[PDB]
Amino acid sequence: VAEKWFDKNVKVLTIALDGENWMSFSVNPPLTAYFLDKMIIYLETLSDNKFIKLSTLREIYNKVPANRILTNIPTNSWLGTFRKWRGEVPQHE
Amino acid sequence: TIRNQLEKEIRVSFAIGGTGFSSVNNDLETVKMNPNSSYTRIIPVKAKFIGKHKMVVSAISKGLIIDSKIIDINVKPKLLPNPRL
């Protein structure tokens, strides 16, 4: 997370993922609970030294207005295909 | 992709050029970019020969060609699918 601060162009940093599968599909799910606590401790060590500003997305929406304009975003998911829900099972069609 | 090094807000237009290529429907595609920023957009074109093509893209403002650049494209023959059962 901190190495992204070095680049001047990283204005907002965004991370998104499933909030329950990561602690439930690992080999040792109890340790992923300790990992999350260590994460929360270390992230507050960067938000106090005024390196990052650990905040919510609504606050970013108001504090950082969007200046650039995107005219088109093609249809897709984070998997780069829709064949997961239509095509990878023979009885999808 | 068009880069803007001016400190003001720019609007240019560009046209394509090739020996078999043809712009589908774009006489002059105008953009609108803010200072010190690039602008990328995709234009639909149709090739009509196969082989080693030469695209020319030129930026045009008020009837004047601002800038031009030549790229190289390899167009492949289009193959038909298997005869359906």
TrEMBL record, chain B:
Superkingdom of the organism of origin: Archaea
Bilayer-crossing regions: none
Family: Belongs to the glycosyl hydrolase 57 family.
Name under which the protein is recorded: Glycoside hydrolase, family 57
Organism lineage: Archaea, Thermoproteota, Thermoprotei, Desulfurococcales, Desulfurococcaceae
Region of the whole protein represented: 556 to 639 of 639
